[PDB]
Amino acid sequence: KETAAAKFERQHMDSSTSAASSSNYCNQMMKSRNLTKDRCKPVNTFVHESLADVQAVCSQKNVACKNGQTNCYQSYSTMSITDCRETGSSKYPNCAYKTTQANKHIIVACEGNPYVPVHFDASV
């Protein structure tokens, strides 16, 4: 089964771009990363930074996750992200999203050895 670390990379990393280039970024990426295959994932964040910089957050500022776990971490630095959220017209299989650019700190939950991100908790 795909590991939690690999799923995080597939759902949230986009080291190939510095930001969203058009309003269709979310439509394109949600589909290409297979986040709309079985249902429309409602919200999703993409991070436009290197993988090592994001992995690095695992040893930055500890903070409790939204759900209360204590293995979340907030990045020291803000990062270029893209926020994707369904539009009112989104209807499976035609999942549709609003793209929004931002430069925010990220909050992830980490696990394993190597200790790496396994969930994207929030942008703040």
Describe the structure.
The active site is at 12 (proton acceptor), 119 (proton donor). It comes from Bos taurus. Substrate binds at residues 7, 10, 41-45, 66, 85. This protein is an alpha+beta fold and 124 residues long. It has one domain: P-30 Protein, CATH 3.10.130.10. The chain has 3 helices and 7 strands; from the N terminus they run ααβαββββββ. The protein starts with a helix and ends with a strand.
Key descriptive features of the protein:
alpha+beta, four-stranded antiparallel β-sheet, globular, P-30 Protein, three-stranded antiparallel β-sheet, hydrolase (nucleic acid, 7 strands, monomer, hydrolase (nucleic acid,rna), 124 residues, 3 helices
What is the gist of this entry?
It is classed as hydrolase (nucleic acid,rna). This protein has 124 residues and is of the alpha+beta class. 18% of the residues lie in helices and 33% in strands.
Number of domains: 1
Largest beta-sheet details: 4 strands, antiparallel
How would you classify the helix and strand content by structural class?
A: alpha+beta
CATH topology: P-30 Protein
Helix content: 10-25%
Query: In total, how many beta strands?
Result: 7
The ordered H/E elements are: HHEHEEEEEE
User: Helix count?
Assistant: 3
Looking across the biggest beta sheet, what order are the strands in? 2-3-6-7
Report the sheet-strand fraction: 25-35%
CATH H-level homologous superfamily name: Ribonuclease A-like domain
Shape: globular
Q: How would you classify the quaternary structure? A: monomer
